[PDB]
Amino acid sequence: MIKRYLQFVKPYKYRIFATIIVGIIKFGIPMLIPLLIKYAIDGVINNHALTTDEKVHHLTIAIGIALFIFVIVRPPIEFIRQYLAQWTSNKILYDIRKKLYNHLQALSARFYANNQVGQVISRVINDVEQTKDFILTGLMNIWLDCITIIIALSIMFFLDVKLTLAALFIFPFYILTVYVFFGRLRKLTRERSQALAEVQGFLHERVQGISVVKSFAIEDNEAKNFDKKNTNFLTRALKHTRWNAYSFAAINTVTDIGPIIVIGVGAYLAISGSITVGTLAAFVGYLELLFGPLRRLVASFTTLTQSFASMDRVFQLIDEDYDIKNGVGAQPIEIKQGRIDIDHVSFQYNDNEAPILKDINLSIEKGETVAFVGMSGGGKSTLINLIPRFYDVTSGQILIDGHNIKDFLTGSLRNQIGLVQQDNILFSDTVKENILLGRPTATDEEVVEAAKMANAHDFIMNLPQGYDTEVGERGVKLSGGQKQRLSIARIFLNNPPILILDEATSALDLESESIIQEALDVLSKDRTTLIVAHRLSTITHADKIVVIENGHIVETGTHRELIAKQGAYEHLYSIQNL
Amino acid sequence: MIKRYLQFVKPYKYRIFATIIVGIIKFGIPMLIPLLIKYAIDGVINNHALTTDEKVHHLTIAIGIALFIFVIVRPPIEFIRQYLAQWTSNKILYDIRKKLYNHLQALSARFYANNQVGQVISRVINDVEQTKDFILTGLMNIWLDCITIIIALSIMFFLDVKLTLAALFIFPFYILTVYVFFGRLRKLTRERSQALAEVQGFLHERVQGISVVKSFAIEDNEAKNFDKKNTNFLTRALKHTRWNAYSFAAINTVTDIGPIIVIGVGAYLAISGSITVGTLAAFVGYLELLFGPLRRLVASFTTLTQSFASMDRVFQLIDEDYDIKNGVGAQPIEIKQGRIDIDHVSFQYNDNEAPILKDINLSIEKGETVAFVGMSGGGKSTLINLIPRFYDVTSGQILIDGHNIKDFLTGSLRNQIGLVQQDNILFSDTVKENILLGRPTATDEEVVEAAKMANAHDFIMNLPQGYDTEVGERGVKLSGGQKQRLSIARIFLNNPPILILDEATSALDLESESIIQEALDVLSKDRTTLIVAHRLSTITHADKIVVIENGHIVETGTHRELIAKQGAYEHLYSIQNL
Ligand SMILES: Nc1ncnc2c1ncn2[C@@H]1O[C@H](COP(=O)(O)OP(=O)(O)NP(=O)(O)O)[C@@H](O)[C@H]1O
Ligand SMILES: Nc1ncnc2c1ncn2[C@@H]1O[C@H](COP(=O)(O)OP(=O)(O)NP(=O)(O)O)[C@@H](O)[C@H]1O
Ligand code: NA
Ligand code: NA
Ligand code: NA
Ligand code: NA
């Protein structure tokens, strides 16, 4: 997995090597201080053979050299060292989210139907952000502490063989201890982040649906439901904390026996006649070089563990399967004549549940306007959404111009089906911006046309700041008949070969309906049109009305014919002016 | 402002003092190492009064002791020190969000109409989380570095009053430099977080409205709109980084002239007779005690700056005004007879724009069923939402049972108005759980009743896992007529004195409508009922139909009467069969 994450760092290897290099060229600085203390003390006074005008000169080039270094050389090193480190990782994260976002937009209706936005976003943002330390503490700092440990161990290896061995005794345990905790922390961190992710999802879901929370003044009740999630997140976060604290003491206690099992031995050796009591003095002086980094790595360890947990979660999302895949046979196909064929189609949202659409057979020739009518929850919506291929039929096939939907390139297919869903969306943008969704690359002139078409242009002008009026988030600042008509506009703008209208009238008064009806009757003159509808009267003109019951097509025909049959269709119609 | 944030820490003062105490009792440990060293060397090896059996002996008591301390005393100190620190702040954050959530649920439709969920949540979560360092690095660590600076400084002053002035010379500049940057960083951090907040809002808004992004295969276009926001966030984050790096080098360069200017003067003073080498050398071993903490504080500084920026943003949200306030006169009032009076009401969403409802006068007696009909965007929705007081009328008054709506306690008022909005909400929960929103404290039996009432009970049983079926996020796994009927259920469950139904039929077929119509005609027998509707026929039975045009009430009357007048009402009705 590290290899994966590394794939992100790849185009930044050099900036990172550089960051490490400049990193090493830093220890050289702290050592210049104690080096300078020795120069004035033993090179101007303890020389005893210098003038009181000569030594008061060398102290003006030594107090001249130091200043130069520290006031000119160090500053740039310090700066670059940091700026680099950051500039690097920060750009890396950028890259990761650029990818995640494309990933999301490529998941299927299903995914988003069984997932919580808040939770998803937690990952894309927080978990990713968390992998930052892996780049910094992991690939840019840990090394310097190991280099320091090599140097130290090395120097010690010369001063004395067995004495350094007195040290290394600790090492194995240290490593064992790390290994013991690592895993459990990784999980605790995982479980923690997940908790956070759940409060996010909660907030998201509620903050957006407050309308309801307000209407029934259930603030107190929901405020509880929140505390549950907010608490769960504490709890988990504490478990995590407890262990980090725990493991920290552990690893260190081990790292601390280090200098002891050394000093103790270093004496029982200098006195037992094994080595110079000067060697013991020097050696023990380097103890800070060995068990210093080991102490830092304990913290570096911790941080990483958490980081791993995070990249886990990131990748886990990245590894989500796309339910609607293009497949090798991909083929941007132009739909020249709206010929739709539904052969033996059968649909199921899941393998466990029952099928919603069972055996559906229906043929729609170019230019026909087919209407779909039936009790609520019959299948209409489901059936329809199978065409733009939002879900893949379970058993059977749908063919546009003889081509099986699956053999189209997603975008191609979808781009040629103007679809007005029943639950229509608006972004917290301007009117224009919203219509432009139907065709982003459109003339401010063409938009105003679509508008006038969907019977929108007019009310758009009365809006403060007209076509540039910013509608509310979710498009709240408009009526029902308004939001809807903007969705309809999008259709004219798209001006596709196939038009599917799932109750595209829902919120319009009788009049406005009349207008859009006319408008549509025109645009729907020579295009393959599918209409789901409950208000029958706006379907009479249909070339063929399809009655759908309990996932089946029960009746088929012209309003005239269906009415004669005095069957299912008639029943429903008959309920209007009766 | 610090005082504010501190108010959160208050109930944790002791745990914090404790964390600081145990914090101090830590430096005592690192010093035990060099003491065991000096004690071994200058104490047992060179005592010149030790039997080879005594020095070894006294050596051992020094080790047996060391192990005890480090393997028994230190561990607990280490643990507690951390666990405390964390347990504290983590609980503090918890508290802060507990408050923020209540804050949100108390903001008005307006707030949420001009704000972006994602952005809000960024604050509640990220910005708050960011204030964590203020507790840790601020109130628990900074001190220890100052204590260390006092201790250090004291020793210098008794060692030479005029050389400590060679050291302290730096101090003022150090402080000046900090002051110079602080502010700019605080902003950069602010601006950065805001950027993050904007990508959040983007993600939220899109990830939830992908349905549309998919339908028009505008993935490429939106993926761009994302990169803009994702980039903006980089940029800003880099600006921030650059400065931190910058300021870091700065402050340190200053902190580095420190040990030098002590040597620059101190050495010159040894010469002229200030004092000798025995002092210049001793006043230099402690240099690490002074310019060590000063170096750490540079980092502590940085971290804080960021923290402040964060609490700024948190508070800024906390300081948001509630548009609908209760006011001293608050009074949980029981509405015994649904008497609604709309006297000269006039509404405007903003002071700049034009009024939507102008001069409306209408009286509704208990048990009357008033219908509201008119072109789309006329005012109906707006008018209606004024009653549950979702927005305060601009000029005029609405009175229920003679009591002015404003004199009710929000919850009281709203709890007594069963409101079925046109754009109905569902949470990613189970069917039951959703209906329970109408009355959380309800009998699994009463729910099933509401259900059967809204004509839902039936389809709920055919659902895999019946009343326990988990509907999709936003309630996606149900038809239109389905989601809606669940909203209607909520009403029966609430069983309020006043019922407002804003197109509560929108997505139902003719039949299902018939059923709920009957169901309602019953529940609406003796209650004050207000109905907004476009499908006229389901309004005929109204006691009084109100025609609303361009924010005005144009016609008033019984379907019978209105039809005779051959005016505005008739026109609209007349378009049904025509
Ligand atoms: N949050 C808002 N800010 C500004 N204007 C708003 C806001 N919310 C709604 N509006 C106004 O909504 C207005 C009229 O709404 P309105 O006529 O009450 O909806 P309606 O006719 O009942 N909806 P419908 O029954 O679907 O046709 C427009 O002229 C908008 O400016
Ligand atoms: N994500 C899902 N998982 C399982 N079932 C689903 C899901 N989404 C929708 N359904 C099914 O929705 C079904 C029938 O939907 P359907 O009849 O197409 O809506 P419809 O009749 O067109 N809506 P409407 O025009 O408002 O009456 C139910 O029996 C559900 O089980
Ligand atoms: Na047609
Ligand atoms: Na009534
Ligand atoms: Na409305
Ligand atoms: Na539907």
CATH code for the domain of A498: 3.40.50.300
Let me know whether B94 and B197 are in one domain.
yes
A476 C-alpha vs ligand 1 centroid, how far in Å? 8
Nearest ligand by distance to the CA of B507: 2
Measured between CA atoms, how close is A278 to chain B, in angstroms? 10
Measured between CA atoms, how close is B566 to chain A, in angstroms? 16
Q: How many CA atoms lie within 13 A of B195 on its CB side?
A: 21
CA-based nearest residue in chain B for residue A578: B537
Nearest CA residue ID for atom 21, ligand 2: A377
| B154 known ligand binder | no
Q: Is B48 left (phi over 0), alpha (psi -120 to 50) or beta?
A: left
Q: Which amino acid is at B489?
A: A
Question: What whole-number distance in Å separates Cα of residue A497 and Cα of residue A40?
Answer: 89
Measured between CA atoms, how close is A468 to chain B, in angstroms? 14
Contacts (Cβ under 8 Å, ≥6 apart) of A303: A133, A137
Burial class of A368 by CB neighbour count within 10 A (0 to 12, 13 to 18, 19+): middle
Helix/strand/coil percent split, chain B, to 5: 65, 10, 25
Nearest ligand by distance to the CA of A500: 3
DSSP category for residue B108 = -
Let me know whether B313 and B459 are in one domain.
no
Let me know whether B313 and B354 are in one domain.
no
Residue from B22, B215, B380 to probe the interface with A (highest A Cβ count within 10 Å): B215
B497 CB near ligand 2 (under 6 Å): no
8 A C-beta contact, residue A572 and residue B509: yes
8 A C-beta contact, residue A267 and residue B59: yes
Distances B237 to A116, B190, B444 between C-alpha atoms, Å = 28, 10, 52
Q: Domain boundary residue among A275, A292, A323?
A: A323
Distances A256 to A170, A295, B74 between C-alpha atoms, Å = 9, 9, 10
Nearest CA residue ID for atom 5, ligand 1: A477
Let me know whether B101 and B23 are in one domain.
yes
Provide the domain limits for residue B559.
326-577
Q: Is the dihedral of CA A164, A170, A176, A180 positive or negative?
A: negative
* Total H helices, total E strands in chain A: 26, 10
Contacts (Cβ under 8 Å, ≥6 apart) of B575: A510, A511, A514
Residues facing residue B326 across a β-bridge: none
DSSP category for residue B95 = H
Burial class of A32 by CB neighbour count within 10 A (0 to 12, 13 to 18, 19+): middle
DSSP category for residue A524 = T
SS3 annotation, A87-139: HHHHHHHHHHHHHHHHHHCCCCHHHHHCCCHHHHHHHHHHHHHHCHHHHHHHH
| DSSP output for B339-375 | -EEEEEEEE-SSSSS--SEEEEEEEE-TT-EEEEE-S
Nearest CA residue ID for atom 29, ligand 2: A377
Question: What whole-number distance in Å separates Cα of residue A265 and Cα of residue A328?
Answer: 70
Q: Is B97 in contact with A230 (Cβ distance < 8 A)?
A: yes
Q: Which H or E run contains B170?
A: helix B170-215
The tokens for B336 are: 């015994």
| B118 known ligand binder | no
Nearest ligand by distance to the CA of A424: 6
C-beta atoms surrounding B53 within 10 Å: 8
Q: Domain boundary residue among A303, A323, A343?
A: A323
A215 C-alpha vs ligand 4 centroid, how far in Å? 20
Strand B397-400, strand B369-373: pairing: unpaired
Angle between helices B293-318 and B142-159 (to 10 degrees): 150
Closest CA to B362 of B391, B342, B383, B339: B342
CATH code for the domain of A238: 1.20.1560.10
Q: Is A75 in contact with B237 (Cβ distance < 8 A)?
A: no
Distances B122 to A101, B340, B387, B448, B573 between C-alpha atoms, Å = 18, 41, 33, 39, 49
A365 C-alpha vs ligand 2 centroid, how far in Å? 26
CA-based nearest residue in chain A for residue B466: A353
- Experimental structure resolution, Å: 3.4
CA-based nearest residue in chain A for residue B252: A75
Let me know whether A314 and A185 are in one domain.
yes
| A375 known ligand binder | yes
Residues facing residue B400 across a β-bridge: B340, B403
Q: Which H or E run contains B554?
A: strand B552-557
Chain B positions touching A245 (Cβ under 8 A) are: 78-80, 82-83, 86
Q: Is the dihedral of CA B98, B100, B102, B105 positive or negative?
A: negative
Let me know whether A302 and A367 are in one domain.
no
Q: Is A207 in contact with B112 (Cβ distance < 8 A)?
A: yes
Contacts (Cβ under 8 Å, ≥6 apart) of A258: A167, A170, A287, A290, A291, A294
B420 C-alpha vs ligand 2 centroid, how far in Å? 21
Rg (CA), chain A: 36
Q: Chain A to chain B, count of Cβ pairs less than 8 Å apart?
A: 444
Q: Domain boundary residue among A301, A323, A345?
A: A323
Q: What is the dihedral of CA B447, B453, B456, B458, to 10 degrees?
A: 100
Let me know whether A418 and A379 are in one domain.
yes
Question: What whole-number distance in Å separates Cα of residue A36 and Cα of residue B561?
Answer: 105
Closest CA to B349 of B381, B317, B327: B381
8 A C-beta contact, residue B417 and residue A216: no
8 A C-beta contact, residue A347 and residue A397: no
Question: What whole-number distance in Å separates Cα of residue A399 and Cα of residue A150?
Answer: 69
Let me know whether A167 and A44 are in one domain.
yes
Q: Which amino acid is at B166?
A: A
Strand B340-347, strand A552-557: pairing: unpaired
Strand order in the sheet with A369-373: A417-420, A498-502, A528-532, A369-373, A544-549, A552-557
Burial class of A514 by CB neighbour count within 10 A (0 to 12, 13 to 18, 19+): middle
Let me know whether A59 and A191 are in one domain.
yes
| Ligand 2 atom at minimal distance to the Cα of residue A378 | 17
Question: What whole-number distance in Å separates Cα of residue A227 and Cα of residue A233?
Answer: 9
DSSP category for residue B437 = G
Question: What whole-number distance in Å separates Cα of residue B538 and Cα of residue B334?
Answer: 30
| DSSP output for A405-461 | GGGS-HHHHHHTEEEE-SS----SSBHHHHHGGG-SS--HHHHHHHHHHHT-HHHHH
Q: φ, ψ for residue B89 (rounded to 5)?
A: -50, -45
Q: Residue A515, SS3? A: helix
Q: How many CA atoms lie within 13 A of B532 on its CB side?
A: 29
Let me know whether A310 and A332 are in one domain.
no
| A567 known ligand binder | no
8 A C-beta contact, residue B543 and residue B369: yes
The tokens for B314 are: 């948190």
Contacts (Cβ under 8 Å, ≥6 apart) of B334: B416
Question: What whole-number distance in Å separates Cα of residue A546 and Cα of residue A407?
Answer: 27
In the block, residue with structure tokens 């101007």: A44
Q: Residue A482, SS3? A: helix
Let me know whether B389 and B503 are in one domain.
yes
Question: What whole-number distance in Å separates Cα of residue A539 and Cα of residue A132?
Answer: 58
Chain A positions touching B511 (Cβ under 8 A) are: 375, 572, 575
Question: What whole-number distance in Å separates Cα of residue A260 and Cα of residue B100?
Answer: 51
By residue count, chain A amounts to 578
Q: Which of B199, B215, B476 sits opposite A388 (nearest CB)?
A: B215
Tally of domains in chain B: 2
Q: Is B512 in contact with A376 (Cβ distance < 8 A)?
A: yes
In the block, residue with structure tokens 């779909």: A372
Question: What whole-number distance in Å separates Cα of residue B122 and Cα of residue B313?
Answer: 10
| B396 known ligand binder | no
B545 C-alpha vs ligand 6 centroid, how far in Å? 29
C-beta atoms surrounding A570 within 10 Å: 16
8 A C-beta contact, residue A358 and residue A551: yes
Q: Is A230 in contact with B98 (Cβ distance < 8 A)?
A: yes
Contacts (Cβ under 8 Å, ≥6 apart) of A312: A1, A186, A190
DSSP category for residue B335 = -
| DSSP output for A343-405 | EEEEE-SSSSS--SEEEEEEEE-TT-EEEEE-STTSSHHHHHTTTTTSS--SSSEEEETTEEG
Chain A positions touching B121 (Cβ under 8 A) are: 118, 200, 203-204, 207
Let me know whether B307 and B331 are in one domain.
no
CA-based nearest residue in chain B for residue A73: B253
* Total H helices, total E strands in chain B: 26, 10
A526 C-alpha vs ligand 3 centroid, how far in Å? 5
